């Protein structure tokens, strides 16, 4: 029997319920589940949608959570669902119950801590080749990357690496949404277009350089899609940068041999985001430090120890959780 390798092949909810009978939590798990269920049911009550639609959705979600195979998948996916639900519900928050827009704080922190307005620096001179070079990681690889990371981490990573990936990705995006709602901020194209004056939630967003991309390949793909968005002032912390950093950290954790590639990818994505005038550098750095700390916790916790002689998941015959106490250089005088 190769239990570690194989997924769950049982289909009876009784097993799940008896596991919940058996499982023992700690304060970590108490606050985890209390917080996540809190957000879930808050979204249930809020989020204007027909009550029958919402009841059916949550009932299907529950019966998907409770059946062992789909249970393990979607129960681990839980934080991602919380992120998505809270994001759209927050799109349905009321206009004058959310904080005022800070159009002056991000340029201040950036010019103070990093020299100049780096978005303006990288956008001083633009052309078509650079427009495409920025369009790729912004609009294509950003959206395709979480699923590719899941597939590659599932096959080539050790077992249960994907659980930690789901946990870290979900909590990163959740804290990102919470901090975007707590602290609103106008992205750089706002200073480019209007300048320094004060904003309000009754103005439409703008693409930036994706407008040039739209002109290039003749659609209107992005102008309409942006200019009626609800996260216009949602440019702190970065979520493009946070996601890119999380994906690259997990690639560098699972594949430690071809590592420079992923750092080059992240720098490509940061340049792409500040090229199209969608972020300040402090935005990307809030996102990146958030993702970094989250991943450090999740790696010196939950995540297992990768092996280097083993090809793919189905050749891993053990789960090995990291150990803070032994591994430290500043040991207990073991020799």
């Amino acid at each position: 029997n190769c239990h570690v390798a194989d997924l769950e092949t049982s289909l009876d909810p009784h097993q799940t319920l008896l596991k919940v009978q058996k499982y023992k939590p700690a304060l970590s798990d108490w606050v985890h589940y209390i917080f996540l269920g809190s957000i879930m049911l808050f979204v249930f009550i809020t989020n204007p949608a027909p009550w029958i639609f919402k009841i059916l959705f949550y009932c299907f979600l529950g019966t998907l959570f409770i059946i062992p195979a789909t249970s393990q998948f979607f129960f681990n996916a839980l934080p991602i669902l919380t992120w998505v639900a809270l994001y759209f519900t927050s799109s349905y928050f009321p206009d004058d119950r959310r904080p005022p827009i800070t159009v002056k704080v991000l340029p201040a922190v950036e010019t103070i801590l990093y020299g100049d307005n780096l978005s303006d620096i990288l956008a001083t001179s633009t052309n078509s080749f650079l427009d495409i070079l920025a369009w790729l990681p912004y609009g294509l690889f950003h959206f395709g990357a979480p699923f590719v990371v899941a597939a590659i981490l599932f096959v080539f990573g050790p077992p249960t690496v994907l659980q930690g990936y789901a946990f870290a990705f979900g909590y990163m995006n959740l804290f990102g949404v919470i901090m975007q709602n707590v602290f609103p901020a106008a992205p750089p194209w706002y200073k480019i277009l209007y300048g320094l004056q004060s904003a309000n939630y009754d103005m439409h967003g703008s693409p930036g350089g994706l407008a040039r991309i739209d002109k290039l390949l003749g659609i209107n793909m992005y102008t309409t899609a942006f200019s009626n968005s609800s996260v216009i002032f949602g440019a702190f912390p970065s979520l493009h940068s946070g996601c890119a950093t999380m994906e690259a950290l997990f690639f560098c954790y699972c594949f430690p041999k071809l590592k420079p590639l992923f750092i080059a990818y992240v720098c490509w994505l940061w340049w792409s985001t500040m090229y199209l005038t969608h972020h300040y550098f402090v935005d990307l750095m809030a996102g990146s430090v958030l993702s970094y700390v989250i991943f450090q916790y999740t790696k010196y916790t939950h995540l297992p120890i990768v092996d280097t002689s083993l090809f793919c998941r189905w050749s891993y015959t053990s789960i090995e959780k990291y150990d803070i106490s032994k591994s430290d250089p500043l040991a207990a005088d073991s020799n």
């Binding site: 998505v84 493009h240 996601c243």
Partner: peptide
């Protein structure tokens, strides 16, 4: 898809 825009 309007999340973190892809097509709808």
């Amino acid at each position: 898809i309007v999340l973190x825009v892809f097509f709808p």
